[PDB]
């Protein structure tokens, strides 16, 4: 390593994030969201109006289901809610990863898989979850894929993201989907919302925290939620919200701009990707393609510098065969001779022996590669604020893998946030931590009192 070393320096500084361009980039954004929010077609960012125009007070009460449906991981709760004081009472949940096969198959099964789980979990009811009366059963539905919402408990399915690839349920609604799905199975359920991930996080961020504006997922997607005000919504009339307030769904991993530090790598991830040109945000943001940009510049110097010697090993041409948390694990090791990186190498991708010279350059290349992401992740927060004319308490409810398990990542992200915002604005925003969401917000459209 060997011009290894060339191959590295290029893509650093490639990848390069400076605070001149995080600047540009915020810019960018602000700029696409006015766009978005000013003709339906307008911009990369859709800006989709969630018909959310109350978020939980806190005095939310009785008992509630929630569905989830991620790119990877599906979930089925129920929640007892208890008020102002009590708050949550009582929570119980299952879940469930989700079979590869289901998300390029039929919308059916699908929906089956969701219906069949959340039968199965009924079952189970009992004690302080017992259905009381006389009555039926309210649901929050959390889908973390973009739709064009009709209603709080209704609307269309856009478009797949994450690697999902259903073309039989683009153009369906969500809510009639999974309604055929529960009868299939007899399970009669009132579903009261729909929301994306973002809407739900932040709905549950506010409930604890009256001063959260905005919410961001930073897991196997990205994308982010904030709460708007009615009349800077242009493109929207169907309804005159008394709060005039709109909470809107992003869908930022869309965004694009020519000040985002793409490189080869990102390119060939992107037209070998089963929806080029679409998501290219969220392709070098979120966990789902941080370990296959790694797996791809590890690729380019065992063809070009022998890096793994004159045979490329044959695990290393298969996409998406490095993970994010195997790049956050070799990341944190610090250790002489780095340990770590080099068992992970051996037993991901079936080489024997790395010396420190090719250790050191894999545990470079992971921190270029997350830092890239966390610091654009600060640049999108930033353009969001200065939406909010907020560039006064201002709290980003945060949730998703990167965020809460990668040490580097979210230190990352905040350090710049703050470098972003400076000495004045930089001690009147906060990001913090913690579905539930999706219940309070059917907890406010509940047929029933207690
Ligand atoms: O789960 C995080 C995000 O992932 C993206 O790929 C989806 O399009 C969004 O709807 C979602 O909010």
Same mark, same amino acid.
């Given at each position: 390593?060997?011009?290894?070393?060339?191959?590295?320096?290029?893509?650093?500084?490639?990848?390069?994030?400076?605070?001149?361009?995080?600047?540009?980039?915020?810019? /960018?954004?602000?700029?696409?969201?006015?766009?978005?929010? /000013?003709?339906?077609?307008? #911009?990369?960012?859709?800006?989709?109006?969630?018909?959310?125009?109350?978020?939980?007070?806190?005095?939310?009460?009785?008992?509630?289901?929630?569905?989830?449906?991620?790119?990877?991981?599906?979930?089925?709760?129920?929640?007892?809610?208890?008020?102002?004081?009590?708050?949550?009472?009582?929570?119980?949940?299952?879940?469930?990863?989700?079979?590869?096969?289901? &998300?390029?198959?039929?919308?059916?099964?699908?929906?089956?898989?969701?219906?069949?789980?959340?039968?199965?979990?009924?079952?189970?009811?009992?004690?302080?979850?017992?259905?009381?009366?006389?009555?039926?059963?309210?649901?929050?539905?959390?889908?973390?894929?973009?739709?064009?919402?009709?209603?709080? #408990?209704?609307?269309?399915?856009?478009?797949?993201?994450?690697?999902?690839?259903?073309?039989?349920?683009?153009?369906?609604? =969500?809510?009639?989907?999974?309604? *055929?799905?529960?009868?299939?199975?007899?399970?009669?359920?009132?579903?009261?919302?729909?929301?994306?991930?973002?809407?739900?996080?932040?709905?549950?961020?506010?409930?604890?925290?009256?001063?959260?504006?905005? /919410?961001?997922?930073?897991?196997?997607? @990205?994308?982010?939620?904030?709460?708007?005000?009615?009349?800077?919504?242009?493109?929207? %009339?169907?309804?005159?919200?008394?709060?005039?307030?709109?909470?809107?769904?992003?869908?930022?991993?869309?965004?694009?701009?020519? +000040?985002?530090?793409? @490189?080869?790598?990102?390119?060939?991830?992107?037209?070998?990707?089963?929806?080029?040109?679409?998501?290219?945000?969220?392709?070098?943001?979120?966990?789902?393609?941080?370990?296959?940009?790694?797996?791809? =510049?590890?690729?380019?110097? /065992?063809?070009?510098?022998?890096?793994?010697?004159?045979?490329?090993?044959? *695990?290393?041409?298969?996409?998406?065969?490095?993970?994010?948390? +195997?790049?956050?694990? &070799?990341?944190?090791? @610090?250790?002489?001779?780095?340990?770590?990186?080099?068992?992970?190498?051996?037993?991901?991708?079936?080489?024997?022996?790395?010396?420190?010279?090719?250790? *050191?350059?894999?545990?470079?290349?992971?921190?270029?590669?997350?830092?890239?992401?966390?610091?654009?992740?600060?640049?999108?927060?930033?353009?969001?604020?200065?939406?909010?004319?907020?560039?006064?308490?201002?709290?980003?409810? &945060?949730?998703?893998?990167?965020?809460? %398990?990668? @040490?580097?990542?979210?230190?990352?992200?905040?350090?710049?946030?703050?470098?972003?915002?400076?000495?004045?604005?930089?001690? #009147? =925003?906060?990001?913090? +931590?913690?579905?539930?969401?999706?219940?309070?917000?059917?907890?406010? +459209?509940?047929?029933?009192?207690?």
């Amino acid at each position: 390593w060997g011009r290894v070393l060339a191959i590295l320096k290029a893509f650093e500084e490639d990848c390069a994030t400076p605070i001149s361009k995080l600047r540009q980039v915020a810019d /960018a954004m602000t700029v696409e969201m006015h766009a978005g929010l /000013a003709s339906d077609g307008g #911009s990369k960012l859709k800006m989709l109006i969630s018909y959310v125009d109350n978020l939980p007070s806190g005095d939310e009460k009785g008992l509630f289901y929630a569905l989830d449906l991620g790119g990877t991981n599906f979930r089925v709760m129920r929640v007892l809610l208890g008020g102002k004081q009590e708050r949550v009472v009582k929570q119980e949940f299952e879940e469930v990863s989700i079979p590869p096969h289901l &998300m390029t198959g039929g919308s059916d099964e699908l929906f089956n898989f969701i219906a069949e789980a959340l039968a199965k979990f009924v079952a189970t009811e009992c004690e302080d979850f017992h259905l009381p009366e006389g009555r039926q059963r309210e649901l929050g539905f959390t889908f973390a894929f973009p739709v064009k919402q009709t209603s709080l #408990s209704s609307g269309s399915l856009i478009k797949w993201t994450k690697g999902f690839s259903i073309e039989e349920a683009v153009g369906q609604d =969500v809510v009639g989907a999974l309604n *055929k799905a529960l009868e299939r199975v007899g399970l009669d359920m009132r579903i009261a919302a729909l929301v994306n991930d973002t809407v739900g996080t932040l709905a549950g961020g506010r409930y604890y925290n009256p001063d959260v504006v905005a /919410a961001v997922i930073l897991g196997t997607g @990205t994308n982010a939620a904030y709460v708007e005000r009615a009349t800077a919504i242009p493109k929207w %009339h169907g309804l005159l919200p008394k709060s005039g307030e709109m909470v809107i769904n992003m869908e930022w991993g869309n965004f694009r701009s020519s +000040h985002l530090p793409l @490189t080869e790598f990102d390119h060939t991830l992107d037209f070998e990707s089963l929806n080029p040109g679409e998501q290219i945000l969220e392709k070098i943001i979120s966990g789902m393609y941080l370990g296959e940009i790694l797996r791809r =510049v590890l690729l380019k110097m /065992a063809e070009d510098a022998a890096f793994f010697g004159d045979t490329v090993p044959s *695990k290393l041409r298969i996409p998406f065969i490095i993970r994010t948390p +195997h790049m956050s694990a &070799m990341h944190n090791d @610090t250790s002489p001779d780095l340990k770590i990186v080099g068992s992970k190498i051996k037993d991901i991708l079936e080489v024997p022996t790395t010396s420190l010279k090719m250790r *050191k350059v894999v545990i470079s290349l992971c921190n270029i590669i997350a830092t890239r992401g966390a610091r654009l992740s600060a640049a999108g927060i930033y353009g969001i604020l200065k939406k909010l004319g907020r560039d006064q308490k201002s709290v980003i409810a &945060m949730d998703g893998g990167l965020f809460e %398990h990668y @040490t580097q990542f979210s230190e990352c992200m905040e350090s710049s946030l703050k470098e972003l915002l400076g000495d004045e604005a930089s001690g #009147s =925003v906060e990001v913090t +931590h913690s579905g539930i969401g999706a219940a309070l917000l059917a907890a406010s +459209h509940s047929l029933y009192l207690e």
